[PDB]
């Protein structure tokens, strides 16, 4: 890993489905 | 309080810090 501008990620509880934090 | 149109939740693992879905 070189570069990581994300902190913490969370997933969805649903179809198949998520988001970037 | 009353209503709950949100269908999941997600925590922050930082500093004391959440949010709603």
């Not at 570069?3 to 934090?21: L, W």
């Amino acid at each position: 890993g070189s570069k990581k501008p994300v902190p913490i990620i969370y997933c969805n509880r649903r179809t198949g489905k998520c988001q970037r934090f």
